[PDB]
Amino acid sequence: MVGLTTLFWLGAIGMLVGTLAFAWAGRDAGSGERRYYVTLVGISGIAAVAYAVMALGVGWVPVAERTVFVPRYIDWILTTPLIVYFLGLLAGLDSREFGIVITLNTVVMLAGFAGAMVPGIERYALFGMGAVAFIGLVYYLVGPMTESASQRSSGIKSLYVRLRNLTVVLWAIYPFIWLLGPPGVALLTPTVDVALIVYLDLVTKVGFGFIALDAAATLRAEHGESLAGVDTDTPAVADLEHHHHHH
Ligand SMILES: *C/C=C(C)/C=C/C=C(C)/C=C/C1=C(C)CCCC1(C)C
Numbered sequence: 001m002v003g004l005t006t007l008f009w010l011g012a013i014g015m016l017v018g019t020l021a022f023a024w025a026g027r028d029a030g031s032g033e034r035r036y037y038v039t040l041v042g043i044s045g046i047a048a049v050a051y052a053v054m055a056l057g058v059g060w061v062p063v064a065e066r067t068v069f070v071p072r073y074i075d076w077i078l079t080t081p082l083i084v085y086f087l088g089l090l091a092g093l094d095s096r097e098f099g100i101v102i103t104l105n106t107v108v109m110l111a112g113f114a115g116a117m118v119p120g121i122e123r124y125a126l127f128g129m130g131a132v133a134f135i136g137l138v139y140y141l142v143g144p145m146t147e148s149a150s151q152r153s154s155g156i157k158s159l160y161v162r163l164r165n166l167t168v169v170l171w172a173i174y175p176f177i178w179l180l181g182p183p184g185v186a187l188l189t190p191t192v193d194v195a196l197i198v199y200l201d202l203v204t205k206v207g208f209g210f211i212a213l214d215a216a217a218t219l220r221a222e223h224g225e226s227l228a229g230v231d232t233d234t235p236a237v238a239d240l241e242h243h244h245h246h247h
Pocket of ligand 1: 043047076079080083108109111112113115127130131134171174175178200201202204205
């Protein structure tokens with residue numbers, strides 16, 4: 001529609017805000033945190049373009065009587081695994097462990113994708129696994145990641161609790177918006193439901209990303225910027241104690 005595009009436009013605005021908030025504050029950061037910054041910027045960025053394109057009407061595919069958005073579902077495939085990846089950076093999982101969280105997000109996002117691409121009502125089955133699988137992911141959020149992060153660093157505990165709790169909550173809302181919204185049985189208005197959806201992606205990235213800045217700001221503020229080497233030739237002596245007095 002013509003008024004539906006407004007949604008993607010709005011979401012795109014929130015993305016621009018985050019992108020800059022993390023880009024500017026990120027460049028001012030020290031050496032090491034850049035990983036968490038570039039990552040956070042990556043999600044807000046990929047999303048920003050997805051909203052801008054969908055906002056123009058491109059990527060829209062027709063389906064019998066309903067319309068599915070490819071760039072939307074695909075955007076999630078690129079963002080969702082990126083979010084869980086962020087959580088993995090905080091705690092610090094293993095090589096195989098990282099593959100488990102990402103592989104799960106792949107099959108999950110794949111369930112929903114084909115979910116809306118159903119010619120009848122088979123979607124109930126696709127999402128069926130999407131829900132069970134979903135719980136699997138949320139489990140990891142409050143699973144081993146708890147002991148891994150709580151034992152990684154002092155600041156990690158703060159960023160882990162705020163991010164994990166916040167993310168899982170709003171994320172746990174997805175099963176409702178997809179099932180109830182148009183992608184499922186369409187309870188509310190196509191425009192209203194979408195508003196919540198875009199809001200869900202916009203809240204995850206920007207939401208923790210904002211809290212992300214505050215926390216990281218305290219990490220560097222506890223010592224005023226990360227320490228580094230200094231250039232100084234021939235130090236200043238003050239104590240040496242002589243051993244020769246009588247000879
Ligand atoms: C920035 C965008 C984000 C964080 C998007 C997250 C999306 C999800 C967690 C979507 C989950 C879904 C399921 C668990 C079931 C199948 C349908 C989906 C794709 C709505």
